[PDB]
Amino acid sequence: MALRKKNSLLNMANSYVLDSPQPSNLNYFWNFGSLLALCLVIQLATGITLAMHYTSHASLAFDSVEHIMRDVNFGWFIRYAHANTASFFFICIYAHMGRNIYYGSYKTPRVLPWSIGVIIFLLLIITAFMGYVLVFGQMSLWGATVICNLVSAIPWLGEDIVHFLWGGFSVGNPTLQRFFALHYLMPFVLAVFALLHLIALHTAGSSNPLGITSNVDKLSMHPYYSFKDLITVFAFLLMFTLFVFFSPDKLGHPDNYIPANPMVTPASIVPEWYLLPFYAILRAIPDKLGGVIAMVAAILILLILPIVDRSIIRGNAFKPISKLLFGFFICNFLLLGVLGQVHIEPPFIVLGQICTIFYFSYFLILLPMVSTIENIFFYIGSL
Amino acid sequence: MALRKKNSLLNMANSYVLDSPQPSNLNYFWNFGSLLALCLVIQLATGITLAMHYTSHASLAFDSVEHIMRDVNFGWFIRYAHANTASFFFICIYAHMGRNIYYGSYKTPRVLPWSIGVIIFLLLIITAFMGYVLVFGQMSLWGATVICNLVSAIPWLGEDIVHFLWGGFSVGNPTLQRFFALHYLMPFVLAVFALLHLIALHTAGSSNPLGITSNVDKLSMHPYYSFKDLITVFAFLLMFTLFVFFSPDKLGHPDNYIPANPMVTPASIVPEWYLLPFYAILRAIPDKLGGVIAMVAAILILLILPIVDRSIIRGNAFKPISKLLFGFFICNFLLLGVLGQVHIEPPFIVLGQICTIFYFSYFLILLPMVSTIENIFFYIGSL
Amino acid sequence: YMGWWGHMGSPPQKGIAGYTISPFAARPFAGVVHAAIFNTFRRTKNQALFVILPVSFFYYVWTQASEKNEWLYTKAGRHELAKAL
Amino acid sequence: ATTFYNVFVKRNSAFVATILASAFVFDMTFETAIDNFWDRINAGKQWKDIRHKY
Amino acid sequence: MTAAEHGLHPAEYPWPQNGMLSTFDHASLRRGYQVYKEVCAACHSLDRIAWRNLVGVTHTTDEAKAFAEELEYDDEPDDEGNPRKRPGKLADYIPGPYPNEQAARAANQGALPPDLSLIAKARHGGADYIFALLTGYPDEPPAGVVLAPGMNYNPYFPGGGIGMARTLFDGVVEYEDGTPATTSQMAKDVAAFLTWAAEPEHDERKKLGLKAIIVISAMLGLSVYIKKFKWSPIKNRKFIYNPP
Amino acid sequence: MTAAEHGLHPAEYPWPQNGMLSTFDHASLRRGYQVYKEVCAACHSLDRIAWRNLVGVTHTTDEAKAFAEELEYDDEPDDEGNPRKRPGKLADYIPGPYPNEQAARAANQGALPPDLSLIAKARHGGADYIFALLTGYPDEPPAGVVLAPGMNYNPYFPGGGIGMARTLFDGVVEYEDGTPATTSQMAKDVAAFLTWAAEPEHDERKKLGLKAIIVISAMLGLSVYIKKFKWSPIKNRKFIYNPP
Ligand code: HEC
Ligand code: HEC
Ligand code: HEM
Ligand code: HEM
Ligand code: HEM
Ligand code: HEM
Ligand SMILES: CCCCCC[C@H]1C(=O)O[C@H](C)[C@H](NC(=O)c2cccc(NC=O)c2O)C(=O)O[C@@H](C)[C@@H]1OC(=O)CC(C)C
Ligand SMILES: CCCCCCCCCCCCO[C@@H]1O[C@H](CO)[C@@H](O[C@H]2O[C@H](CO)[C@@H](O)[C@H](O)[C@H]2O)[C@H](O)[C@H]1O
């Protein structure tokens, strides 16, 4: 017996990166998982390095970030890499989730990796939210203030919970120091859940773009998918290079280069772009608590896809009507993102409400209807 | 099939904490593994909490620790728990390693868990060394200075490496901020290696005090060893209680309540007690590089126990001469510890050299001789 | 070298009958007083030398070293200290 | 004993409810008992004992 | 929002540093330093820049030491513990015009002139915004605009009323290199200088970027060849089926 | 090392707070505060203690506010940005006698009197060391000891020559509670007060410890019963072997 199979430690690595049997027909949308692993490795390497030069105390935080930019050798690179890779992490995660929804990756027997995936996504959001506060610029402070005040909506105990989160009566030094400790921790938690969702997947294996079994025709993970993953690693590095070296501030807000000032309120307080669709959903509901619930529900509703999809066939490759609906769902999610950063003004207010209704009706009405009708069309159409 | 066996995630937990088949005759020295897990959980919980209130900048570090002691609710407890549990972690680890050496746990087929265990021990040492510097009192600073200057002994590049570690020309702010980031990280690395050494063990299972196979007579981990582990959890908590609540500074050095001062040198610079034997070994060799090598070798030599033990029988339960030698080896290691904190004065200088020779001769001469002779005595004695 | 329940890797077992009784049917502390006194005495007596010999030797060595060191740093020990350095 | 077993012990839901209710009562009574005992062994020494002078 | 509330968007000017392979013009940086020093520094600090930062960018070691040595900085107390001053060193930061915010506001009719070290990154528009703002004070506010007391009309500033008056007029500075100091020239130089102050890694970053782009592109090309090479047995596979 | 180089070891005095269940004596703490304030505070700071810390320990809210309000602290600058003072508040820290180290050393023949907030933890011996040192200045140094200039002989201090002279003499303080202020009484009170300053959680910590000890002991006893209960089928197992 080969050592890679005999030794239990080597055999675990072998099972995931070498002998792992994969479908032979995965397309390039199966490359996002390893890109997400790459973003995670870059964030750990850059984040731990920033932590060696950053000071979490509110009197020094913003200046420690300027010290990183100006005095630490290659500090500018490490900071820009960390800030831009946070955006790339979300591009890759939305692509990965888009692939999973289009190809029916959430269907049995893969409900459990999908459900752990939904938690990974929530952990990413919290991680990135706390990391952004650490700069302690204007957007850091004011974004923390408005987002943490959403917790005040929790009935009875909400205000008490907010003061407890802040460690005081507004966002200040206690808040910043705790966000640093939690920002350092959360990526380790996220790496554990990423590993868990792959262990859960390993029972059924990867799905594939046709939606059929691949037990008939498997390929080893290495060398086939190893070398296929390198192509997108270098494509990603080229995109990364263009942002980090040539346009390092394109994805950021200029106001975060002003030190936090509790007196002056910035013109517009908006989240980072990757949170914008959830913010538009929150704005759509007039009630404070209503808005919070809708915003959370917009993520938690992903957990019901395994139920509301009634199709007897996995994925959309062969479903023209499902493909059209999916296209509308995606474009609506991008429009919600754009509406998350407009001013609360006509006619964007009503538009945001219609887009919010469409977002939820995809899960609750349209997908169950369309998937039911397509079942009948496949059966009658092929009689 | 039971869900605990069917579901792959549940089945992994099941395999380690519930159905795991254990020998039915483990004694209380098999309880140190779960005590070490308890110390690790306490250090993670207390350490992450301290990180929410601590400031790593040299101008604020010592004062942030006083703020924790004085102003943070239960800050005194969290700090004393963290500081004392670091000592308990080493008591438990020495007991655990003592059990492993006495019972032959390093012999085939358990070389790999033992070898990963040696790395765990090195990671513990580095973790605790960096954590102690974070207080930035007199012992923090001066202990960092002396220990980091040992690296200057590396030929050719040693001085350059030290300046690179410090981030400057002496121990200062850059050093403290990097030690904070690495102190936060290292426990996560240590938890991974702890898990790895248990996965490696799971192929052969636990050894037992008789040194024979337990494949004939197994007991489930739960409820038997679960409930046996609770006894020592509460015994540990009682010891912890007596230090943390009634004598929280007994194991510490008063000089670490003086703020770091690069000008004034403390009367005596000694490491924390748990590093003292290694320090005595270093002092024994007059050469700087010699001393460093001996000190590292004193830990790395544990890796050769699987080779130098020539016995055909696992462990010392039935070996009167090996038991006597083991007793001398242990007491010598404690004497080395005491000599690590005496002044460099007669007659402790020569004593430290004799004890150092005995430490190494156990591995290189005595154990191979005694184990060879006992093999012959067992065979002839039972003819 | 270890399997799992049902195929643990034991040589075939045959001819052994094992018996036991329910924890609810048994007195958990039956014979505790006898054990605590006589069993512990037997167990301790048989291991006593393996502790006493090394502990007593290293304690003696330490005591001699620490006493000499103390004496060398008194007035009376001045001359012997001068030679020792 | 049968009655007691049947009501509080037999169903785990009831057993856990009884343990938690007992923990609540223990917690409140133990607090009060320790407070009084601590005050008696340290009588005349605490701020509450000298406060009246000021 | 009304366009006034947003402020007019600045033109895109062709800066020397625009361009993937382009550095700053260091002669413009030097001239911009002189405008900062003779005009802006009366009201604005540049607190994140040390004298050593100018060296090998705009000035030699000696010129920068000379600037530092002309100033007095707080030293460590003397032996009786009394305060002392020392001459400046290269390590020192360029000192600001005011001791605190209150003094700054008192000198500027309530308005607080921001520190300019990050201003090029802290405003949409960057260099273009700074150039547009400095050169965009009309002689007369558009009819109908009511300025608050101590405000000046400037369309680039959101709301239109800014607490900073026009400061650049032809020949307020005499450049040491003989360049005609027009309003436009000084605004261009100072905007370039402040852009440098906000991002002093700029020139190095873009050159390292060029190296990265080249290597990564080559590696992308080779990774495509190697993937296709390894995959060709799978892609080229053929089957013959004979139903059993 | 010589015994002189180590310093004489202090006696173990029976402090009220010695004892697993014992608090500080708060009346002694109050008297010790008064010794700090009237004797030690001339040379030593207590920088880690705020006025609010005394409240409900040694003083009422009003007494502590009165102490704070008698002092002036630096306020925020006024509207012209000029410095201002304000009266003290409970949040303020007790102010030290010197502006800096240099001033402190100049007043004490070169020696620097340490801050006393942590001194009970920062010295082997704790309260016993402080009491021994304050009461252990002999009238005459042992014959043969040569003191360096500005040094005083004290055997408890390592090396024997300390820069602090004897300061406690019978009746230097008049206690407000009528206690006779002897050298010994004042040294005991101030040592108690400084021990409190180093560890103000002391009283609460020990009471929580008592609760922990009781609960954990009970749980240890019950965990032994439960382990033995669950293990009895294994311990009681019997075998009959019939060789096949
Ligand atoms: C004598 C006063 C004074 C002089 C001279 C001065 N400024 Fe200002 N500046 C101000 C004040 C006051 C503000 C704040 C205006 C406000 O917020 O209403 C300001 C604001 C600015 C802003 C920020 C506008 C914004 O978007 O918030 C920039 C950029 C600026 N100044 C650059 C310069 C440059 C470049 C120069 C000269 C070369 C200069 N200033 C000269 C007083 C001055
Ligand atoms: C007028 C000066 C002066 C007064 C009054 C004074 N001290 Fe000091 N004290 C010093 C100086 C100077 C040192 C430093 C001595 C040295 O390091 O040689 C010192 C050192 C100490 C030390 C530390 C000794 C060591 O181990 O390093 C303690 C404790 C101490 N003082 C407590 C007190 C207490 C308690 C009082 C009064 C109730 C007091 N002092 C009054 C000047 C004073
Ligand atoms: C999923 C992984 C992570 C994500 C998505 C993430 C995201 C972010 C974001 C968005 C910021 C704000 C960046 C900026 O605009 O300046 C940030 C800052 C920071 N992050 Fe992370 N981060 C991750 C992992 C880590 C890790 C593991 C550390 C280890 C400490 C860390 C340390 C920091 C520090 C110190 C800062 C503040 C300095 C700065 O702004 O650059 N991060 N992070
Ligand atoms: C740190 C974030 C993540 C990492 C590193 C990660 C990694 C991966 C990897 C390597 C795979 C196998 C290869 C592939 O299909 O791309 C995979 C598959 C999968 N992931 Fe993720 N993932 C992450 C987040 C998520 C999220 C947020 C979800 C869901 C909401 C998700 C759901 C899934 C599912 C369902 C699969 C199986 C898809 C299939 O093969 O059909 N993952 N992931
Ligand atoms: C194996 C686990 C760990 C060990 C052995 C350990 C050991 C130590 C030690 C010896 C100190 C000096 C304590 C003192 O005397 O005050 C310390 C301080 C510290 N540790 Fe840890 N530690 C561990 C895990 C962690 C973790 C996971 C964190 C998370 C950040 C952390 C954060 C800190 C901080 C902030 C301090 C400085 C404040 C203080 O001294 O209490 N530690 N650690
Ligand atoms: C964080 C530190 C550690 C943890 C949490 C840990 C945990 C454990 C646990 C739970 C076991 C099984 C139960 C037991 O025998 O006690 C075990 C066994 C073992 N550990 Fe450790 N351990 C640690 C460090 C080490 C070190 C430093 C070594 C070796 C130098 C070591 C070597 C072993 C060996 C050889 C075994 C198998 C012993 C046997 O059952 O015969 N471990 N450990
Ligand atoms: C939760 C699912 C993840 C599985 C790992 C969890 C833990 C796990 O394996 O538990 C067991 C309870 C294990 N004890 C034993 O093997 C054991 C075996 C024989 C006898 C005794 N006692 C005798 O009297 C034993 O105690 C133990 O303490 O090990 C921890 C270290 C593990 O934690 C980790 O590695 C992660 C981190 C805390 C290090
Ligand atoms: C950075 C991550 C930290 C290290 C973690 C390493 C990867 C995760 C491994 C944990 C999962 C182990 O859980 C289990 O492991 C075994 C051992 O290979 C694997 O077993 C799998 O491969 C083996 C042979 O390669 C097959 O006989 C088996 O049918 C198949 O299930 C599976 O993966 C999983 O059933």
From TrEMBL, chain C:
It is found in: Mitochondrion inner membrane. Pfam families: UcrQ (PF02939). The keyword Transport applies. Keywords: Electron transport, Membrane, Mitochondrion, Mitochondrion inner membrane, Respiratory chain, Transmembrane, Transmembrane helix, Transport. The keyword Transmembrane applies. SUPFAM superfamilies: Ubiquinone-binding protein QP-C of cytochrome bc1 complex (Ubiquinol-cytochrome c reductase). This is Cytochrome b-c1 complex subunit 8.
UniProtKB/TrEMBL annotation, chain D:
It is found in: Mitochondrion inner membrane. Keywords: Electron transport, Membrane, Mitochondrion, Mitochondrion inner membrane, Respiratory chain, Transmembrane, Transmembrane helix, Transport. It is a single-pass membrane protein. GO terms for cellular component: mitochondrial inner membrane; respiratory chain complex III. GO terms for biological process: mitochondrial electron transport, ubiquinol to cytochrome c. Belongs to the UQCR10/QCR9 family. Component of the ubiquinol-cytochrome c oxidoreductase, a multisubunit transmembrane complex that is part of the mitochondrial electron transport chain which drives oxidative phosphorylation. The complex plays an important role in the uptake of multiple carbon sources present in different host niches. Component of the ubiquinol-cytochrome c oxidoreductase (cytochrome b-c1 complex, complex III, CIII), a multisubunit enzyme composed of 3 respiratory subunits cytochrome b, cytochrome c1 and Rieske protein, 2 core protein subunits, and additional low-molecular weight protein subunits. This is Complex III subunit 9. It comes from Yarrowia lipolytica (strain CLIB 122 / E 150).
UniProtKB/TrEMBL annotation, chains E, F:
It catalyses: a quinol + 2 Fe(III)-[cytochrome c](out) = a quinone + 2 Fe(II)-[cytochrome c](out) + 2 H(+)(out). GO terms for cellular component: mitochondrial inner membrane; respiratory chain complex III. Its EC number is 7.1.1.8. Residues 69-80 have a biased composition (Acidic residues). Heme c binds at C40, C43, H44, R123, Y129, G163, M164. Residues 27-198 form the Cytochrome c domain. One of its GO terms (biological process) is mitochondrial electron transport, ubiquinol to cytochrome c. Keywords: Electron transport, Heme, Iron, Membrane, Metal-binding, Mitochondrion, Mitochondrion inner membrane, Respiratory chain, Translocase, Transmembrane, Transmembrane helix, Transport. It is an enzyme of class 7 (translocase). It is found in: Mitochondrion inner membrane. One of its GO terms (molecular function) is heme binding. Residues 69-90 are annotated as: Disordered. Binds 1 heme c group covalently per subunit. It comes from the Eukaryota. Its cofactor is heme c. Belongs to the cytochrome c family. This is quinol--cytochrome-c reductase.
